[PDB]
């Protein structure tokens, strides 16, 4: 009921205390011109007056009209080509094509002995701690146990407990939030979207959805662009689990629905115990997810967590928890109860100062419109 | 809780428990329970109410219409008239006199409704109402609360004192609690108890024993504490149960031969009586309210159950105390909680009333307990 | 009731506990500044107000950018070109990490478990239900059919009693909830409060009404996200709805929510109803309002606790049974009593009103 | 039968028992009222009527709007913004508790249970058939087919009373039923009793007939609750209707109704259609009404009790045989007799028609 089995725990025996992690190491085409004759498979970079450039590959051994000095007729005939098919037009794809062979072609035997790409270290943490008070009195204590035959203290500390827990969940979460890069952004942003927020409402994120099923279907799909992103950047995989926030969980919820327990158990039996400290289910089979139970706006985070505890991206590393307390204040005599943690958090370094915004093994969305 | 129930009996020994009522609670609040009349003589049934409506209400006009054999009610009380004209040769104006002489001089006869059975079952005649009527209410449990047992060099004291201390300083500490118990007790009991007052204020103002008025043996302040005492039996089925009074007031100026301090400590008389008066009653003594004044009502029950009284004490206990070591100092402070509050019935029509009051609302209940006078005095001080 | 808290009060007055709850500054994005992948900048537009922006590119923001007006347009581009994103109060979770991790340390920064935990005291209230019947009726009862007569109006009058008392549960319900689809669960273009089935924003541009009933639901989860928000105590474990309303939900997630199908298909072999047919979702168990009086919903939190409820229901002296004869005409006189008293989370009858964050109370048009 | 009480007669005259039921100012808003949260008001729109409105959000009515119009202005805005909630009867009752638990009492308020249980006195009413055959067909059926004449004609007869009678106790049903889709259950665009499937508001906005048809079940819903509020028993539990419109029901759901596939999988072996189709919805048991007139359902209400049904069939002589010979032509003759009568909740045959609260027949159309 604590969260962290999406973090390397690797806990301390003593503060500093040390955590490790799996850190990762981490084109001149020929001119399309006017009179060019293509070659089938040769590929040629053209720069249009309009919208830049385009790198095309011929799959036509065509001649680029040698009549078309101004550049806007040449322009209009590449796209006539382009049109065609001609010339077909694909970006990165050409220049790795052509990267390659300028490799091949220039290789070398030479001592082109690289490193495998993870330097691998570890980071030095306190065992920083947080705490409790349970700030009850004497006269509900007492008839606590005088009405109702009730615990008093023991009820207190149940809660007292369930609450430091929670709240110490909910400081990994807001860390993660905190180093999590923005997602539906860069290679996971679509042309017409509003930058980093997914709205149910906006037919370019829902992708020409009708209604909220499928709008809520637009949402995993983008969950899954954003696991990928993740997983180009760590070098380690694809995202494995999601942070969200309730109503984010409730439409992922309602979509493909075997993916979470609705506690219909719970519910039947007339709420046995809420147990609202764990993982809703395992979303389109992929994704473990928990809910935010603090969320401040409305959004999801999506993470990848290696079977490796060295290789989460956020370390959590319990040296003391539940240190019970007990007191009274003096000054009226009250009880006092409490409790303490020591746990630390560990952060894979990707240069808190190298963590704002930049943690490539988590991506977080903003939602709207549910 | 042993430790607190034993703290309990050594504390609540040291209050005036016998001038409320005491009742118990066992919840945060206390239900209190008490026993009104609002009018006292005869039957209270329908069927004496109607024949008291069918005969007369014996105004002067027609005092002098009835014969032999006819019935009158004054006042609610039924009288039969003997022989004619009762009342002719009467000649007070006063008709409540006029007819305490004719009760007297047999012209008229204090009449009884008891019958034959069958005169009430033949007929299926009415029956008695009740006359009291139980009422309950609850109010909060209240507390006050000590950091009085003050140890660090204290309980390097306390250890030189360490062959008695330990208890010591919790009974101690019990004892400023319970008087100020005490002293919360007297002054609900204080404020509800009704202002006595005869023809003006106890014969036309507060009795006033100053130099300037009559500093001259304290007597007359002893008949007017009688006095209220008979006040109380003319308002209630019951006798004074107990009396309250500060020593200017009559703790000490009574003790010029109608005062007694407790020849015998043990008969009739609580421990914390200060004495008893030569019309009896228990005698307390407050000493703290600029007041100076004297209180006498009643405490009664039934069974075992405190059911009468003008303020009605409940504590609640499942006395506590603490040691909290506060830097140096392993202080001990004592927690001590209680319902005490006056039948709000007494300034209600009904329950609609009631239930939008409460009984330890005092600034409500002030001077309405029915159950207890208060006699305000002037001193020559 | 069986989602209050009992706290059974062998008392009248009586009370009952609750656990109640106790109850940007991001330096600057301006012109010629430059941004620096991962930090956070705030600025403020013409139209549209603050906003606070988050950087994936280190770009210098226009130093041409002398009017704010081209100032806007420049912070919009660099957004449109991917350089920015914008979150609002998520931010604020990042500026106060950032200040309490820089500023940590042991001192004395206890937090409280935020809880106030408290009292309510509470009288027994009553409730009476006469049998009403004469003696002819009960002898031809038994005499007809071997029916146990007076004691079968018992059973049905003890029903009915507790039936009622359990009506008023919900009345209060209903007048302590807070009013739902407000707030946090509005649709900019909804209707506050009222859910109509032909409103297409509600419905969220439902094809028909299998998606339109799906889009009830859905509604419901919000609601019940706002009350696990609001108490801090998680999500509504509960539907309260009317017949309207429970048929319409019904509808989906199969049988889930039960009509005791056995009964209909032994042919009335009983009805049952008394109680929460089911479980909604697979998460809420849904109780029947059977005294609706327009058409409506109810979502509402109840945990493992019995001073986590929101609301309490104590049965001192339940289903007392009363018995007489009246001899003007020689007939029976059988009834029934109660005193249970009832009390909600203070959340401060006054303080009742629309106050109560445990539930949520939804008016449904369009069926 | 299954589907109303029996309680069987020892004789005429005769008698069933029936469990027959017994049968505020919110201040009003105005300009510079600070409405607070939770609180309600009156507000009559100059257009389109009167709500109530309770406040989420404490705020002032705009104190210019001394003119009505710009009063309506304010509230909407103020309504738009959330800040203000309508609901009509939710809200009725919500002031109505209030001011009897705030300025409640004691006393002594003993009411009666809503139930009075009552009886009827009925006659066993007789019905019987004759076969009315003759001898040269009881010769050659035997003769020609192997078959034994009178024998198949007396399962046909006996089949024939007991569809009979069937029958009539459904046209008592009917008779008896309320109109449904009136009331309580109509739409606001309806057409008063009468379902029509070509009509897009009765059907929904439905399209085709998967849609078009669990629109009517919605209407079939919407009459059970009607029902259930009525008799203050609970839910329809059974239907009666057409083959028309059985037919519709049975294709949505899936496995409501059964297609007795083994009946025509081996080529109408034995099609039994004299007991009910199946249980629509998994709620209501199913019977086509194979003497329908015109084309509709009635939705009925049945409890366990069999004096909890609102009409209750009383047998008291079956299938008794007659037989003999006609001399005129001597022809044999073949015959049943039964003695039942019928018994119908008061109500109050005349305080029956129209008035059986215990169903709700609609009219269809469109099909």
Redesign the interface.
Known sequence: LIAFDICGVQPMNSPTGQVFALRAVYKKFPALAASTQTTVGDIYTHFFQETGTVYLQASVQVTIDAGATDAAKLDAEIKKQMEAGALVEIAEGMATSIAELQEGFNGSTDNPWNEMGFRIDKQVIEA?????????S???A???????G?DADA??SG??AT??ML?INREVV??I??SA??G???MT?TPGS????FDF?DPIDIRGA????E?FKALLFQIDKEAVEIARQTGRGEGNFIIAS??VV?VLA?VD?GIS????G???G?????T?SVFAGVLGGKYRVYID?YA??D?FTVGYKGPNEMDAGIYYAPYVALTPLRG??????QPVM?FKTRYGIGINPFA?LNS???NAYFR?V?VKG? | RPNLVALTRATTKLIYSDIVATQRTNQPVAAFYGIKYLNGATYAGEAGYVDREQITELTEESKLTLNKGDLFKYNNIVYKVLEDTPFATIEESDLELALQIAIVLLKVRLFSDAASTSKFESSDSEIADARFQINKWQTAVKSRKLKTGITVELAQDLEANGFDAPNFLEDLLATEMADEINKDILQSLITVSKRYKVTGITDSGFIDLSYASAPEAGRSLYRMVCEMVSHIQKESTYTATFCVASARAAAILAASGWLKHKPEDDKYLSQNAYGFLANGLPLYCDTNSPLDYVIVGVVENIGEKEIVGSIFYAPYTEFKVVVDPESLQPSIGLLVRYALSANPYTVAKDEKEARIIDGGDMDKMAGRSDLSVLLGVKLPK
């Open positions: 920083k701690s947080r705490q409790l008070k349970a700030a009850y004497i006269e509900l007492q008839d606590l146990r005088a009405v109702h009730m009820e207190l809660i007292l609450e430091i709240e807001d860390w939030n905190y890069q923005v539906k952004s860069g942003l509003k930058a980093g927020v409402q009708r209604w909220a099923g709008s309730r109503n409730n309602s629905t327990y609705a506690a219909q719970l519910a039947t007339f709420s046995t115990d809420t609202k139970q401040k706006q959004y009274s204040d003096p000054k009226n005599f409490g808190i704002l915004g930049k977080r903003y549910i």
